[PDB]
């Protein structure tokens, strides 16, 4: 009994582009970096410290 075809014999990789699920969420190199969404520590009322009138008080 012939072992079906030689192509039926197992190969380490196959013509499936995404051969293993391992590499489908990996970061693709030349992609532009993505700006983070609305996630950083609240800082809005402290601007009246870089307001230049803060110093020279008298």
């Amino acid at each position: 009994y012939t072992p079906d075809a030689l192509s039926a014999s197992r190969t380490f990789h196959k013509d499936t582009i995404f051969e293993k699920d391992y590499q489908k969420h990996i970061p693709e190199l030349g992609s532009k970096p993505t700006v983070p969404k609305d996630k950083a520590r609240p800082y809005n009322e402290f601007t009246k410290t870089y307001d230049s009138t803060h110093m020279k008080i008298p």
Binding site: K32, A40, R41, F46
Partner: protein
Amino acid sequence: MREVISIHVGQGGIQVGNACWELFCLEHGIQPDGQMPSDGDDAFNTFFSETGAGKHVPRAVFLDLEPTVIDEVRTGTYRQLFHPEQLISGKEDAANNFARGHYTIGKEIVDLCLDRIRKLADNCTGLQGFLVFNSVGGGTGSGLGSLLLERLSVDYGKKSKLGFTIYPSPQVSTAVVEPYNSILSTHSLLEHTDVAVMLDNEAIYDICRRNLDIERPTYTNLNRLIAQVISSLTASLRFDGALNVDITEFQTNLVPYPRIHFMLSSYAPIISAEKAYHEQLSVAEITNSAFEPANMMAKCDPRHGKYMACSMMYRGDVVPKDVNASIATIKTKRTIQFVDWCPTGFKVGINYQPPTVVPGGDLAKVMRAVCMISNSTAIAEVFSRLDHKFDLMYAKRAFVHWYVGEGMEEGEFSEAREDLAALEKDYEEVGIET
């Protein structure tokens, strides 16, 4: 409202700075040219300053007496990012000699460095502190680190200073004359550094071989790991979380006495892309891995000694109840025991921002990460080994002329040795029960 000034001196300092700044740029979405593509408000002021037209100048300075690496920085992919006049380059290398970089050649470059530091700091009026990077076992790096620490300690005074210093490995090393300038630099930095962090290379080699399954890692991977560590430490200053901690709350929960300011750092998880999917990555198990001694980035075995302070920072989607459960398990296990006069020494921080994976890197995408900084009495073993090396070297006065001939007197070795012996005494003395 917060800015931190990063200093990179020595070839190791510059190589680490390149990697960490690349990670920072990727984190904040800047292109290599330093331009923002047209895409909730930034808060990248910590690392970059906006010129007014789109360009973002990093808040860093590079110092070296050997112009090769700085020339490569000015030639590589980041030419348009760095400000050209904040990359200071010398003429001749110190050639692994501490006295050359501390007494003869660095004098004509420290003035320019101070001028540029002042010019960078005048912009920062909510400045948090200074971070410094240097290889201890390198001549110019060590000498300029000592000189800059001495000058800044009197120029600014109370500003917090953290030094992520690269000590030579105990059993392996590159040079042969590293003990001399190693102890010289340690003596210099003892009273000039608020926080010191160990960065030996063989332990991170071990981490890479065991976890990342890389048989021949190079310095690039090491720098990437260090960059991930520093990003995890700093993310609290630029990303909201349940518990926020600043660099000001480090000398209060990590420095019981001013003499003891050397802390060792861990990181977790260290998982490759091929490894991430078959792991659930529980917070409890990553914490268990972090406290495992072989997961240390320093060849210091904490189960040799006591624990004084323990500060851990989480980033991702962790939950405080699981945090407390993991801490309870850590306290329950008997292989880890703290010092008698510290009932509670745990300082926990939480941040919402998950770590970002770098293209061309090797770490995988994860949803939870922990960075670790601890005080252990077992750290004295590396100092004892350096003492043994220095005794073996100084017994027959080898290499001594190479330090005598350029202006530093012979008596520095004796005082440095006495100081390090005093540190060894302090480390044991802080380890006896009342």
